[PDB]
Amino acid sequence: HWGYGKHNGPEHWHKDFPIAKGERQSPVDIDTHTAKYDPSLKPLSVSYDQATSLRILNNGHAFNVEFDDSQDKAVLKGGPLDGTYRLIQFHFHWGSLDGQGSEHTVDKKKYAAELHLVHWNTKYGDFGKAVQQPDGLAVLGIFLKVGSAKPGLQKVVDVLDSIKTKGKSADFTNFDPRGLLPESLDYWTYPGSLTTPPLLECVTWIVLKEPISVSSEQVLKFRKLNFNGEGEPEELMVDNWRPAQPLKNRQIKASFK
Ligand SMILES: CS(=O)(=O)N(Cc1ccc(S(N)(=O)=O)cc1)Cc1cccc(NCC(=O)O)c1
Ligand SMILES: [Zn+2]
């Protein structure tokens, strides 16, 4: 089954998931000179004060921090979005070295990692229905560079030893995702897809311009996770990113001048 190895990685996905070669795949390179300011984008509203984190799971591809999405507790609204999008999980993609790891790129620059906060459009009732719709999901993407530590990340780092291998989970209550945001909410936006199988073309991407800084010790702990299950050969969870896909007939819009 699919993964990030030489034998099962992104260049193979199209054999089981032909939409991999579709018209609105993600991630993309963001050419900053070609993206145009869109003065019509409405202000972006990140409302995470009532967020209820539940659990952290190593799914063999990344780790997901899961939220209660059975009420409007943590929502994304505004920007390019019509209606209300509920936070269901966040996860990261990262590299084996600090010079790669992000999915989106900015003028071909790769960041050390990328955070994805995944939200679904409440007009579709549940996540599984939402992913069947062209406006079903909104993913807020945030770049990570290596420098100063991110204090709000450390609770995540410290639990990773307890979910080293695929299929392990741990309680992860009372985590505040506001501690993972940068100061500015300036962004780029475009219509795209999930970046893993099933690669569904259901995402409005919102990629923040300002990266967050994390320390080398924080990212080193990400790279100690395993893709494998317990009692199986160790394969470090690194380089779990899809490279940039063709932009095709899309325009990237900027929220900022
Ligand atoms: C297997 S998973 O946990 O990785 N997952 C969730 C997901 C993927 C990618 C993003 S991202 N990088 O674009 O923000 C956001 C959410 C993939 C997924 C999404 C939608 C439906 C299914 N259902 C099961 C199936 O069909 O495998 C699975
Ligand atoms: Zn992702």
Curated annotation (Swiss-Prot):
Per the UniProt entry, the effect of residue 61 to W is: Impaired activity, rescued by 4-methylimidazole (4-MI). Impaired activity, not rescued by 4-methylimidazole (4-MI)
The chain residues annotated with the modification Phosphoserine are 162, 169
Q: What is the effect of changing residue 62 to S?
A: 2-fold decrease in enzyme efficiency, as determined by kcat/KM ratio, and efficiently inhibited by chlorzolamide
Residues annotated for Zn(2+) binding in this entry: 91, 93, 116
Substituting residue 89 to P results in: In OPTB3; in Czechoslovakia
Task: Choose any GO biological process term that the UniProt entry carries and state it.
Answer: neuron cellular homeostasis
**Keywords, alphabetical:** Acetylation, Cell membrane, Cytoplasm, Disease variant, Lyase, Membrane, Metal-binding, Osteopetrosis, Phosphoprotein, Zinc
Question: What pH-related activity note exists for this entry?
Answer: Optimum pH is 6-8.
Its cofactor is: Zn(2+); Co(2+)
Which chemical reaction does it catalyze?
A: hydrogencarbonate + H(+) = CO2 + H2O; urea = cyanamide + H2O
Which residue positions are annotated as catalytic? 61
Q: Mutating residue 196 to H leads to what result?
A: Higher affinity for bicarbonate. Enhanced proton transfer capacity
**Can you tell which superkingdom this protein's organism belongs to?**
Eukaryota
Q: What is the effect of changing residue 62 to F?
A: Reduced activity
Task: Please describe, based on the UniProt annotation, the reported consequence of changing residue 194 to F.
Answer: Normal activity
| Result after altering residue 59 to L | Reduced activity
InterPro entries linked to this entry: CA_dom, CA_dom_sf, Carbonic_anhydrase_a-class, Carbonic_anhydrase_a-class_CS
Q: Where is this site: Involved in the binding of some activators, including histamine and L-histidine?
A: 89
Q: What is the effect of changing residue 61 to G?
A: Impaired activity, not rescued by 4-methylimidazole (4-MI)
CDD domains documented for this protein: alpha_CA_I_II_III_XIII (cd03119)
Q: Where is the Alpha-carbonic anhydrase domain?
A: 1-256
Q: How does it assemble?
A: Interacts with SLC4A4. Interaction with SLC4A7 regulates SLC4A7 transporter activity. Interacts with SLC26A6 isoform 4 (via C-terminus cytoplasmic domain).
Family designation: Belongs to the alpha-carbonic anhydrase family.
Give the protein's biological function: Catalyzes the reversible hydration of carbon dioxide. Can also hydrate cyanamide to urea. Stimulates the chloride-bicarbonate exchange activity of SLC26A6. Essential for bone resorption and osteoclast differentiation. Involved in the regulation of fluid secretion into the anterior chamber of the eye. Contributes to intracellular pH regulation in the duodenal upper villous epithelium during proton-coupled peptide absorption.
Name the record gives this protein: Carbonic anhydrase 2
Q: Which gene encodes it?
A: CA2
